[PDB]
Enzyme design. Structure first.
Site, mmCIF file in Angstrom:
data_model
loop_
_atom_site.group_PDB
_atom_site.id
_atom_site.type_symbol
_atom_site.label_atom_id
_atom_site.label_comp_id
_atom_site.label_asym_id
_atom_site.label_seq_id
_atom_site.Cartn_x
_atom_site.Cartn_y
_atom_site.Cartn_z
ATOM 1 N N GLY A 1 0.822 -1.205 0.000
ATOM 2 C CA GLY A 1 0.000 0.000 0.000
ATOM 3 C C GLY A 1 0.851 1.248 0.000
ATOM 4 N N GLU B 1 11.906 6.908 -4.630
ATOM 5 C CA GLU B 1 10.841 6.354 -5.447
ATOM 6 C C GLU B 1 10.898 6.855 -6.874
ATOM 7 O OE1 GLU B 1 6.008 6.305 -4.607
ATOM 8 O OE2 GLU B 1 7.265 7.950 -3.872
ATOM 9 N N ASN C 1 8.028 7.666 -9.521
ATOM 10 C CA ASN C 1 6.618 7.815 -9.770
ATOM 11 C C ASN C 1 6.371 7.598 -11.270
ATOM 12 O OD1 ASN C 1 4.216 10.445 -8.873
ATOM 13 N ND2 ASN C 1 3.921 8.356 -9.540
ATOM 14 N N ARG D 1 4.542 8.132 -13.944
ATOM 15 C CA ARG D 1 3.489 8.916 -14.605
ATOM 16 C C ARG D 1 3.836 10.402 -14.651
ATOM 17 N NH1 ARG D 1 1.165 11.484 -10.603
ATOM 18 N NH2 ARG D 1 1.021 10.585 -8.501
ATOM 19 N N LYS E 1 -1.129 6.579 2.315
ATOM 20 C CA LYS E 1 -1.964 5.395 2.609
ATOM 21 C C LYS E 1 -1.519 4.644 3.890
ATOM 22 C CE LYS E 1 -0.018 4.060 -1.868
ATOM 23 N NZ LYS E 1 0.255 5.506 -2.064
ATOM 24 N N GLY E 2 -0.992 3.404 3.774
ATOM 25 C CA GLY E 2 -0.629 2.553 4.943
ATOM 26 C C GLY E 2 0.747 2.782 5.569
ATOM 27 N N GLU F 1 12.053 10.553 -7.400
ATOM 28 C CA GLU F 1 11.953 11.370 -6.210
ATOM 29 C C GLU F 1 13.128 11.107 -5.331
ATOM 30 O OE1 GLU F 1 7.150 11.451 -6.343
ATOM 31 O OE2 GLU F 1 8.218 11.531 -4.378
#
Ligand SMILES: COc1ccccc1[C@H](Cn1c(=O)n(C(C)(C)C(N)=O)c(=O)c2c(C)c(-c3ncco3)sc21)OC1CCOCC1
Length: 482
Positions: free
Chosen positions: A210, A329, A331, A333, A211-212, A316
């Site tokens: 997963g 990370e 991303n 998109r 927010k989580g 990132e």
């Protein structure tokens, strides 16, 4: 010169492999709008016909009742069920089905919804429809935060201290074997606390499915918040990562084609963040000195290439005032803030997406050639004396179907906001200082409408603090973003 009158002609001229005449937009609101305007503008330049590429939008009844603008704007539209995202915009099976039936040759999903769902490009690929975004194999590799960080580590990109610090894979498709996950994760609180000892506090206890995400400050409150991340996302492996200290979130913008060529397009900086949200993004990321940013760009390009990335993505990082930085990370998109990058780089990003999905290589995109100082329509390859950012851009998030804001203050500022009542303003100056002050003047004008007054005046003040004028980095531990 040369003449092309249709997408099929363009593909022949520019050495591509798939003709895209009609695109299905799997989004609404400003994303739908942006996609159509950016591609239509390239269509005009290229074919002298703004409708050379047709668009098909999906439309919920909420949006049809409202007569949201993106509907009128589109060439043809397809009514879809209302409700939450699983019906309509984030429903992969529905997207593919609509794509197959029209038919279109490609799908653009933008950001939000189903944009990060690998099943999307998988099911499109199997059905022979292009995706304006990376393929599923690349999307899977970056899907798991564990596989993603250890991939990064094996390319010797710096990462923050964490449960799998130092783990490595032997390095055509990169894979991460059970062994590595088992050592990168923590099974239970005992193992968690043992791991916590190599890492230090405060850390994120976080679920890779997963927010989580929970923030833990000490060994004493770890167990509860761990039990909480576990019970939130059942079945997920969880790992731990330390917080950064005196840091900003920043991003390298990468653009890759289908032949292994990848290019960085400077980056972006989030200069103001509040409650896990991007309030102010800037381009270029001047907080980072060039020598160090160029290395972050080289890292992102390496990462993009090795996972087989295509289309436009962002890498990132976290950047500390002491010059250290850490991968977080990729991303996979476009983001809502991408115009910052378009503007400074003179790259039309959704039109770059469209052309790349047609199998056109990077050195045949006019914008990329010009950026790299080559002729606009030459054919010779280019090795990616670096190009210079053109001016500076402030983007600001504004708050309290789409209304546009063309500001009287300046041709250099524009914004929008959407009811279902938040949006962005984008400002260009010749330098950071001009861009800030253009922004301020524009926001003073925004703040005349009763709906924006209270919230925009707050923002105006934020842009006028010495700490912001000076581009000071906040001290203390850095919160995560969504
Ligand atoms: C003053 O306009 C600025 C200033 C700074 C940064 C960006 C912009 C602009 C803001 N902008 C727009 O001006 N326009 C108009 C139609 C007025 C336009 N096409 O000029 C936009 O539509 C637009 C849109 C739809 C933007 C957007 N949609 C989603 C996120 O951002 S940003 C933007 O982005 C550029 C638009 C032209 O292509 C390169 C990006």
């Amino acid at each position: 010169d040369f003449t092309v009158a249709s997408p099929a002609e363009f593909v022949t001229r520019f050495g591509g492999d798939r003709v895209i005449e009609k695109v299905l937009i799997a989004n609404n609101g400003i994303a739908a709008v942006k996609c159509m305007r950016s591609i239509r503008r390239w269509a005009y330049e290229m074919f002298r016909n703004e409708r050379a590429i047709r668009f098909v939008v999906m439309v919920t009844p909420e949006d049809l009742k409202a007569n949201a603008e993106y509907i009128k704007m589109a060439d043809h539209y397809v009514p879809v069920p209302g409700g939450p995202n699983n019906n309509n915009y984030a429903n992969v099976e529905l997207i593919v089905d609509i794509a197959k039936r029209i038919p279109v040759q490609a799908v653009w999903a933008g950001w939000g919804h189903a944009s990060e769902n690998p099943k999307l490009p998988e099911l499109l690929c199997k059905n022979g429809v292009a995706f304006l975004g990376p393929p599923s194999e690349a999307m899977w590799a970056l899907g798991d935060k564990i596989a993603s960080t250890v991939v990064a580590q094996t390319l010797q990109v710096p990462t923050l201290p964490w449960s799998g610090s130092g783990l490595t894979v032997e390095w055509k498709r990169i894979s991460v074997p059970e062994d590595v996950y088992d050592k990168g994760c923590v099974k239970d609180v005992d193992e968690g606390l043992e791991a916590a000892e190599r890492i230090g506090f405060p850390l994120m206890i976080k679920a890779s499915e997963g927010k989580g995400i929970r923030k833990a400050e000490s060994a004493e409150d770890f167990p509860i918040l761990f039990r909480q991340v576990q019970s939130e996302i059942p079945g997920s492996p969880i790992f731990l990562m330390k917080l950064a200290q005196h840091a900003r979130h920043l991003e390298v913008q990468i653009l890759a084609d289908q032949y292994g060529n990848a290019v960085s397009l400077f980056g972006r900086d989030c200069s103001i963040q509040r409650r896990h949200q991007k309030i102010v993004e800037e381009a270029p990321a001047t907080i980072a000195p060039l020598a160090i940013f160029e290395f972050m760009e080289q890292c992102a390009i390496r990462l993009a290439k090795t996972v087989g990335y295509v289309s436009a993505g962002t890498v990132e990082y976290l950047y500390s005032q002491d010059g250290s930085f850490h991968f977080l990370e990729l991303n996979p998109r476009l983001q809502v803030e991408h115009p910052c990058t378009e503007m400074i780089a003179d790259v039309n990003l959704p039109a770059a997406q469209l052309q790349i999905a047609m199998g056109v290589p990077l050195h045949r995109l006019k914008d990329i050639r010009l950026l790299y100082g080559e002729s606009p329509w030459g054919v010779t390859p280019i090795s990616f004396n670096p190009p210079l950012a053109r001016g500076h851009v402030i983007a600001a998030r504004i708050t309290s179907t789409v209304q546009e804001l063309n500001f009287r203050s300046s041709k250099n500022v524009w914004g929008y906001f959407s009811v279902a009542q938040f949006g962005h303003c984008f400002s260009w100056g010749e330098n950071r200082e001009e861009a800030i002050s253009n922004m301020v003047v524009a926001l003073k004008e925004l703040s005349i409408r009763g709906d924006f007054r209270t919230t925009v005046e707050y923002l105006i003040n934020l842009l006028e603090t010495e700490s912001f004028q000076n581009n000071d980095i906040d001290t203390g531990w850095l919160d995560y973003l969504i």
